[PDB]
Amino acid sequence: WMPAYACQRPTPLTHHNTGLSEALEILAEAAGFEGSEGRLLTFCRAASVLKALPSPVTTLSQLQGLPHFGEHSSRVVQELLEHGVCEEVERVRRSERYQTMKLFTQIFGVGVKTADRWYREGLRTLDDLREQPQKLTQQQKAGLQHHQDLSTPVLRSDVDALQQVVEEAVGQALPGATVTLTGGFRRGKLQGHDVDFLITHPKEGQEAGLLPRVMCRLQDQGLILYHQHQHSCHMDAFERSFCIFRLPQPGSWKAVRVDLVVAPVSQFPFALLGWTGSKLFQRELRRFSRKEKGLWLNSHGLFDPEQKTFFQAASEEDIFRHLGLEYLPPEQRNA
Ligand SMILES: [Cl-]
Ligand code: NA
């Protein structure tokens, strides 16, 4: 028996159903490209269930009794088991609409709304974008300049090298300040497409003005190709810098997307939880909090809108406990 909420079950990094989950996730991604959030969620939930299964699915009988497996998701798995290929998935892969939306949404600073607008305006290629630079934000221009590197998977060793320079800069600016790797790499991934670091200090307030000092140090060492600093107002209400680092390599260098976020230590457990992902895990964890416990969970806190009260967490463990969930370490949140 398989819990319906992704936050109520462990989902390891590696699993037995990658071909089936990948296919369902193509249909999910395509649905989101068309603005069908409902269909996206449905396909993502089906895929996530397969990632939690402790055995490979070899016959359609194994879908029986699983949550989130309606007719459409089931037919997709059936066709892959029976024919090795799913016609609908193959049509999506070959579609100009899907290929273009994937191309554009992968660029730094481009989301679905923008990509869809560009598609409707007749843009198809990266050179089409470069030919219309009046249409681009500074982030997008930087994303296009570095797109080859930025589409190259980031390795765990790259992440290690990056974490060292960030830690050096932080340590030199403010002794006692800490840097914590979050995102998929904290969940144990060996490759990824960007790198996220969360920065805090044990004495609330000592972190004020730290981020610009860190970026100054890194910029002076030649490690920064692009930097956009943003003051506080899902991590958008924290002070943050959107960066492209120039990562040295032997006789060469590679551009790498890195976000740095500063959180006051009181909000650190919530920021860490939020930014550790996976995207589906956190979506479901927030849904659970709201639907089951009537609490609003976000990257800054856990709030009862009716009592106007906040929960003081010291750790991620505290948050799970308060919600009545068994704790899952980051490597089991790969939903
Ligand atoms: Cl994710
Ligand atoms: Na993007």
Coordinates of all heavy atoms in Angstrom, one line a residue, residues 184 187 189 276-281 333 335, ligand 1, unseen atoms left out:
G184 N 18.6 19.9 -5.7 CA 18.8 18.5 -6.0 C 20.1 17.8 -5.5 O 20.1 16.7 -5.2
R187 N 19.7 16.6 -2.3 CA 18.9 15.3 -2.3 C 19.7 14.2 -2.9 O 19.2 13.1 -3.1 CB 17.7 15.5 -3.2 CG 16.7 16.6 -2.7 CD 15.4 16.4 -3.3 NE 15.4 16.2 -4.8 CZ 15.4 17.2 -5.7 NH1 15.4 18.4 -5.2 NH2 15.4 16.9 -6.9
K189 N 21.6 14.1 -5.9 CA 21.8 14.1 -7.3 C 23.3 14.2 -7.6 O 24.1 14.8 -6.9 CB 21.1 15.2 -8.1 CG 19.6 15.1 -8.0 CD 18.9 16.2 -8.7 CE 18.9 16.0 -10.2 NZ 18.0 17.1 -10.8
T276 N 15.1 22.7 -0.9 CA 15.7 21.4 -1.0 C 14.8 20.6 -2.0 O 15.4 19.7 -2.7 CB 15.9 20.7 0.3 OG1 17.0 21.3 1.0 CG2 16.3 19.2 0.1
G277 N 13.6 20.9 -2.1 CA 12.7 20.2 -3.2 C 12.5 18.8 -2.8 O 12.6 18.4 -1.6
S278 N 12.1 17.9 -3.7 CA 11.9 18.3 -5.1 C 10.7 19.2 -5.3 O 9.9 19.3 -4.3 CB 11.6 17.0 -5.9 OG 10.3 16.4 -5.6
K279 N 10.5 19.8 -6.5 CA 9.3 20.7 -6.7 C 8.0 20.0 -6.4 O 7.2 20.5 -5.7 CB 9.4 21.2 -8.1
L280 N 7.9 18.7 -6.8 CA 6.6 18.0 -6.5 C 6.5 17.7 -5.0 O 5.4 17.8 -4.5 CB 6.5 16.7 -7.3 CG 5.2 16.0 -7.1 CD1 3.9 16.9 -7.4 CD2 5.1 14.7 -7.8
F281 N 7.6 17.3 -4.4 CA 7.6 17.0 -2.9 C 7.1 18.2 -2.2 O 6.1 18.1 -1.4 CB 9.0 16.6 -2.4 CG 9.0 16.1 -1.0 CD1 8.8 14.8 -0.7 CD2 9.1 17.0 0.1 CE1 8.8 14.3 0.6 CE2 9.1 16.6 1.4 CZ 9.0 15.3 1.7
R333 N 13.4 12.6 -0.7 CA 12.4 13.6 -1.1 C 12.4 13.7 -2.6 O 12.0 14.7 -3.2 CB 12.7 15.0 -0.5 CG 12.6 14.9 1.0 CD 12.9 16.3 1.6 NE 13.3 16.2 3.0 CZ 14.0 17.2 3.7 NH1 14.3 18.3 3.1 NH2 14.4 16.9 4.9
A335 N 10.6 13.2 -5.1 CA 9.3 12.8 -5.6 C 9.1 13.3 -7.0 O 9.7 14.4 -7.3 CB 8.2 13.2 -4.7
Ligands
CL1 CL 12.6 19.3 -8.8

